[PDB]
Amino acid sequence: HPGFAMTVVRTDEVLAEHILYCSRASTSMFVGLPSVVRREVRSDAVTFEI
Amino acid sequence: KSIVVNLTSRLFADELAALQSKIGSVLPLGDCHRLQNIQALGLGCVCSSPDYIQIMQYLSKCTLAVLEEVRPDSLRLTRMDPSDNLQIKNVYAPFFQWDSNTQLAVLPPLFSRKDSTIVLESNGFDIVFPMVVPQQLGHAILQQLLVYHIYSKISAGAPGDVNMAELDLYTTNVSFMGRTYRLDVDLRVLDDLSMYLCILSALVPRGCLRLLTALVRHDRHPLTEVFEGVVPDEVTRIDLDQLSVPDDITRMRVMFSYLQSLSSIFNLGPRLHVYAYSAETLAASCWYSPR
């Protein structure tokens, strides 16, 4: 035994499955419209983004 | 952007997996069309007694390409355009541990052959890969192996001048990005820069006193008054009278020609800018800007 004790500290994870309750009509959402924007034209394929 | 290299004889089982590793790699190619043979790709026209400047000037006059697929009956390439986004794998031998957001360069190979070339015997032509190193390392890898090639010529004639214990301490150890790299050395590539940097080494002290004493007038540029007090005292005692005037012209028509052809080979631009890199997948997206 050297002349000193010590304290040890860890961290430990847990996969927890949760329960979310959320009451009626609290948030109010605003949904836009999908707008397609072409960006890339290659010789092989043409990509898009919505 | 596709180039097919036909192979009239099928590959061996040893030569197949040697190229399965180097599946993404930058290769020079003497013409930019697709119907080309196995004798076209690589530096086999100039490397297979190689000389440095003939390969460095060849890369800027070339059209590089990227392997994408290694099949048994043939090979497949991809022509690399000016300022073109790609995805290049770090596969080059020896390994240098590229960093993201760097400026990769393309150098001629100067290390041993088993890292440089892959020996093919299915068709009898050995292909040569270039040296793809970051720009700040590839110029520190060569401002020492050109120093090492000098002292391996001094100690070959006068062996008492060069200490081998201190020559192989500094010249073969390069530290970049906090990592020391020990480089493998047994140099017949750099036997022309050593004969250009030394044939230019003597004409510079004779040349600056010839050119400071010619530009003396009322309309002198003011900074050259200050840059006079840097040249040493022994250079300011050179007798230019021991040569003739028609001999002194040829010590400028030769002198400046080793200040241009020696300068315009280090400012060559077959470089490419990596913008994303992962150190365990060894993949790198980039863009290639010639010159």
Binding site: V36, R38 | N101, V230, Y275
Partner: protein
């Protein structure tokens, strides 16, 4: 119904199909050539529908964005959008981090004098309360300025596009090529008037197609200590003139530098400056003066970014 609306949007942004004229049949060659010439003649007249068809031919190359990840105390939340970005990559960190230096944050590392920079000295102090949080992360702010190796570590990146600032980690997106689209407007590069020094001003040179912006990083001494000074230039005079014009700008610095080097000579002390090539502004697109809170900031337009290696000048 809503899936059919997207079918009309994708099929209105497609590229035009290439004309397939069959050169093997008789009448099929005659009816395919006629639709080339009934269609070029309706792309030449000045009507609006002919101009409506003329812009679908889109040969546009694209910007290539880089996603960086900076500590939040080396990068202010109050940064103007369009600030130029550098990258300092001295070593390999234990974590995947990066150090991005704006030209108002590289003013605090340099310590160049406020007589040169009267307005970006008040700004660089009010954002950086001590200047220590920058200087603690570079342990060689004297040995990289003595030997002249600080410009070998910076890589130019491009203007800023998005800044998601948080408490400890700030996400910074740049635009390394092309014109950067915001994240939708086109972000032009913003420089202070304090740093940018024009060369095209004079008391008839050709109106070329293009004008370039350079970056000079210059080594010098202040308080008998190593420091530096970064300035920006703008001209389209070709590379041989501007290097000879930057030497005329730094005439007063070199003459006051080698008073001390006439005493003693180290070979670490000779290298002086380095000129980069940042990007190309198009011709006669004048920058618009803006103010921040009063900081005169020139914001350009259509600045596509390039990347030149640092070439020494002296």
């Amino acid at each position: 119904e809503n899936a059919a609306r997207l079918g009309r949007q994708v099929l209105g942004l497609l590229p035009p199909p290439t004309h397939r004229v069959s050169l093997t049949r008789g009448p099929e060659f005659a009816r395919g050539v006629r639709d080339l010439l009934s269609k070029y003649a309706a792309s030449t007249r000045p009507t609006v529908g002919s101009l409506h068809e003329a812009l679908r031919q889109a040969p546009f190359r694209q910007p290539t964005y880089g996603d960086f990840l900076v500590y939040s105390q080396t990068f202010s939340p109050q940064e103007p959008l369009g600030t130029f970005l550098f990258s300092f990559k001295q070593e390999d960190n234990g974590s995947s981090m990066d150090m991005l230096l704006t030209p108002t944050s590289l003013f605090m590392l340099s310590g160049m004098e406020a007589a040169k920079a009267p307005q970006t000295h008040k700004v660089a102090g009010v954002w950086y309360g001590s200047g220590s949080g920058l200087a603690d992360f570079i342990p060689n702010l004297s040995e990289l300025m003595d030997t002249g190796e600080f410009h070998t570590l910076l890589t130019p990146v491009g203007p800023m596009v998005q800044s998601v600032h948080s408490t400890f980690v700030t996400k910074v997106t740049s635009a390394m090529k092309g014109v950067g689209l915001a994240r939708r407007a086109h972000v032009g590069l913003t420089l202070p008037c304090d740093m940018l020094v024009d060369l095209d001003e004079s008391c008839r040179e050709p109106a070329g197609l293009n004008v370039t912006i350079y970056a000079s990083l210059v080594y010098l001494r202040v308080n008998q200590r190593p420091s530096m000074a970064l300035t920006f230039f703008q001209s389209g005079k070709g590379f041989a003139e501007v290097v000879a014009m930057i030497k005329d700008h730094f005439t007063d610095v070199i003459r006051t530098k080698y008073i001390q080097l006439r005493h003693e000579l180290y070979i670490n002390r000779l290298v002086f400056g380095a000129v980069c090539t940042l990007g190309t502004v198009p011709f006669d697109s004048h920058p618009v003066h803006q103010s921040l809170n009063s900081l005169p900031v020139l914001v350009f337009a259509n600045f596509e970014a390039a990347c030149g290696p640092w070439t020494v000048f002296l």
